[PDB]
Amino acid sequence: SLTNSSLMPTLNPMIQQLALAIAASWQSLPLKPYQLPEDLGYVEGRLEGEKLVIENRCYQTPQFRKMHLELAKVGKGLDILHCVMFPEPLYGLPLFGCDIVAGPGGVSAAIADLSPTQSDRQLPAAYQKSLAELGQPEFEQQRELPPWGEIFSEYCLFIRPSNVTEEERFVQRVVDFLQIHCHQSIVAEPLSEAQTLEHRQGQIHYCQQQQKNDKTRRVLEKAFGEAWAERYMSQVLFDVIQ
Template structure:
């Protein structure tokens, strides 16, 4: 949801710093001075900084993945009056021989909205699950979704990719309880270790969610390191079918669509979703990505 030159270290996005304006002097009438504005907490930059450091350390063959023009940075003024503010969306993307696309969208809208959407898509010659982190902060609280979305729901696949994460999931679920109703049609795209929670406190995100994010990311990279390419035609066809079904669903049902439409308009939003966030179908159609056969 983009990269620098090939074979160069990832750009570590630094945390924003804020300075409090100086106090005005009290007037002769003894009126209280105006209050300095409260700095806006940048919640998800530490998550992305951690991810970039880990990706650099554990993926020595990491390269830049092309981001279409106009998507690396986008901003808009939204709201009116005292509620008006700047919303920015920064996009980053990378790839490796095993991971077709590693991409992130980082949306910052001050006190009204903060989002980190970080997804890793494996190459279609591997049976790896997808890595997905959807971290959203709104005025009323936080929406947290972490998972390794499976390609298949067979016993063998779960034993290979879900069972090793089971204890990690259970330990984090103690502090991040189930967030409630979830669309039934989406259930097939999530694993038994789907961590879905709605914490209300920033501190929970900064500690428990951050801890779960680190554990899920590192475990996923363990799977990537161990992955071997699939070679038989029937399995490759099933992997392709499963990947495309997931991408179609996500592109059609992307919950960020309404947000982006409101901020940046329909043309930019639809191109961002289909031309970058979930771009596999288009790349196959244009011949930019040739799936294994």
């Protein structure tokens, strides 16, 4: 749980709410710890500018090879929540991810998705059906995905929330995604070796494309340098499996 977090009480309220919702969804799963490189938990660094503070929590279950919740703060103003549930390819589940970035003046970016791992870039039929049933959410300020964002599903939300009502609507949609995802993980069956390979490739591709995110990289570089940032992005955030 998040009562021991040093960052949490200082983060944007939407970020606090979403972190609680994610922890609540994971709490009663068959969790084991997942050891990050160098058993990383808390880390802080500064070069010539602002300090970056990061808290990492990571778990695994039989269906999810790596469940990573990262909270971060740059200086006084910039707050970040990062979460990815990396599936075990044997079960063919999609990739849950979300990213929230907030400054003093409010949340600038809120993105969440259940991303495909199939070569045809479609979600499994059960997900399509369940997601369609939620209906189209209405948000006033949508943002267009960057070029490397071809990895995201047609259900991807990428917005700037315009008011508290939209903040709460976005959090609820993420809770709905997680409820669907946790349910489908109970009914998933181990796949064939050939299908497992296809899902593994989809996850590798997701990770390679997420590494092209310069907005993330530049934050890390300004606090820790180029070599540290490359190691962090490739080995901690978006590790390529074999």
